């Protein structure tokens, strides 16, 4: 229970970071995975 206490402390200190992780990963995963959709590969744009 004590080691769970310190783990839960360090996790409650970063609950907002976890919320931000989930918020961003839910708003870019669809756009990022869109690339590997036309075939057995991923598109790339080479501006050089």
């Amino acid at each position: 229970l004590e080691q769970l206490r310190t783990v839960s402390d360090v996790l409650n200190e970063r609950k907002q970071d976890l919320a931000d992780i989930l918020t961003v990963a839910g708003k870019f995963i669809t756009s990022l995975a869109e690339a590997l959709a036309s075939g057995p590969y991923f598109k790339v744009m080479l501006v050089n």
Binding site: A37, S38, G39, P40, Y41
Partner: protein, 153 residues
């Protein structure tokens, strides 16, 4: 008696508010508990291999510190995904040799990773030989193309 009054009232209110939640949560945890139990052997080795490959991918990222180091050799791509045959599936199950698990670590003695096919709606299993890409030519004005789209190229 007075302490029992207080304790009973407090515990009763707690359980009234948080009993249905616990009951239905423990009801809905059965399928996921079975799921996690089935894929036990694919956990220790997976964590170990990701831990060991973390420095190897980190050195590739950080050997320069300003870009990524890659070898680019020209290769030919497979046939573009066709509309009805290649729709996504989330029915993937199992592991190598029919059961969940991990291979032995990929050294240089045994390089290639044995490809794994799963119920997905796409695969690159049959590409064991050189053939021309069936949609060899196409047009994006009237959408008239040569070749026949296939799942058996």
């Amino acid at each position: 008696l007075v302490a029992a009054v207080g304790f009973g009232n407090t515990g009763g209110d707690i359980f009234e508010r948080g009993g249905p939640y616990l009951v239905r949560g423990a009801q809905d945890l059965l399928p996921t508990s079975a799921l996690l139990d089935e894929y036990s052997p694919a956990l220790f080795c997976t964590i170990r291999n990701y831990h060991d490959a973390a420095p190897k991918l980190a050195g590739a990222l950080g050997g320069n510190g300003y870009s990524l180091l890659t070898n680019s050799l020209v290769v030919g791509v497979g046939n573009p995904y066709v509309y009805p045959d290649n729709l996504p599936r989330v029915n993937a199950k199992g592991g190598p040799e029919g059961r969940p698990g991990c291979w032995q670590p990929i050294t240089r003695d045994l390089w290639p990773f044995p490809y794994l096919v799963m119920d997905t709606g796409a695969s690159i299993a049959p590409y064991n030989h050189f053939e021309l890409g069936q949609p060899m030519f196409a047009e994006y004005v009237w959408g008239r193309q040569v070749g026949e789209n296939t799942i058996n190229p």
